[PDB]
Write a protein that binds this ligand. Structure first.
Ligand SMILES: O=C(O)c1ccc(Nc2nccc(Nc3ccccc3Cl)n2)cc1
Length: 295
């Protein structure tokens, strides 16, 4: 748009591309996400997204504006320094120090508990949409998109969506999501920060499902009442026994593993809430370290 000196392309999300951009008049640097079906844009999603502008929390990336013009919809966000995905890549030889991992998890749970208390769900959480700054904060970006817009497959044209963070109830085709889907994704991210490998790097929907099954055991009616009646459930699923859990995130102490196991419960009703998670003993010693960021 005319308004920006549009510095660069930041990345490509499920719902659209992100640019770093400078406002010519004001000089403020912002993150610009262009959404896109493109029939002209739904009114219903416009009000719902516009509503998100009222979210203010230290752990949520601020949505500054929502601009509908032409067939495109632009979300203008405050600009943060780096995404968690790039930071994890850069930390791969050493590892993110545990106190910083714990600090990030704590903050992210706070951001989720805030959103969830406001009845806003993410439903797309992943390292690419977690943003960090030089002072140790971490923030969730891109809430409320899948609820307002409905969930397509790709952004617009031919992108490979990440399945790695999808909750099992989603993979099994449940129509109604709950806040528990975000706890699941956060659990996957937590595990990935600790081990420096994705916990469940599925190639396809079924590979993703079966990777979860091989690790946590194939769910049944005992651990997950109602599971066998879900729309994509097949009695033909192989039956894998659950893995010893100390094999899943070995570096983690027992507090971390117990918290992680509660974030990974099959049954969304037994899965821990962000609010209860914040009270877990894992966070007794939580501090706020400063990351080393190469910008
Ligand atoms: O790669 C890098 O060096 C890099 C990645 C991200 C950076 N900042 C930033 N701030 C805010 C948001 C955002 N993305 C975003 C915007 C809208 C919706 C979702 C997302 Cl993830 N990105 C800066 C550098």
């Amino acid at each position: 748009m005319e308004n920006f000196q549009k510095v660069e392309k930041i990345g490509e999300g499920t719902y659209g591309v992100v640019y770093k951009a400078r406002n010519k008049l004001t000089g403020e640097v912002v993150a610009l996400k262009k959404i896109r079906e493109t029939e002209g844009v739904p009114s219903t999603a416009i009000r719902e997204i516009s509503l998100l502008k009222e979210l203010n929390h230290p752990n949520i990336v601020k949505l500054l504006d929502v601009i509908h013009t032409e067939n495109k919809l632009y979300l203008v966000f405050e600009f943060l320094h780096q995404d968690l995905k790039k930071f994890m890549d850069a930390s791969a030889l050493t590892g993110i120090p545990l106190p910083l991992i714990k600090s990030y998890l704590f903050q992210l749970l706070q951001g989720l508990a805030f959103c969830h208390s406001h009845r806003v769900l993410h439903r797309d959480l992943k390292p690419q949409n977690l943003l960090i700054n030089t002072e140790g904060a971490i923030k969730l970006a891109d809430f409320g998109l899948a609820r307002a817009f409905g969930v397509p497959v790709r952004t617009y044209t031919h992108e490979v969506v990440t399945l790695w963070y999808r909750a099992p109830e989603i993979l099994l085709g449940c129509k109604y999501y709950s806040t528990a889907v975000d706890i699941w994704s956060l659990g996957c991210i937590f595990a990935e920060m600790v081990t420096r490998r994705a916990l469940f790097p599925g190639d396809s929907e079924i590979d993703q499902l079966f990777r979860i099954f091989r690790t946590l055991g194939t769910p049944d009616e005992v651990v997950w009442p109602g599971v066998t009646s879900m729309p994509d459930y097949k009695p033909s699923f192989p039956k894998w026994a659950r893995q010893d859990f100390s094999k899943v995130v070995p570096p983690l102490d027992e507090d971390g593993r117990s918290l992680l196991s509660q974030m990974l419960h099959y049954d969304p009703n037994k899965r821990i809430s962000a609010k209860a998670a914040l009270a877990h003993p894992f966070f007794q010693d939580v501090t706020k370290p400063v990351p080393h960021l190469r910008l």
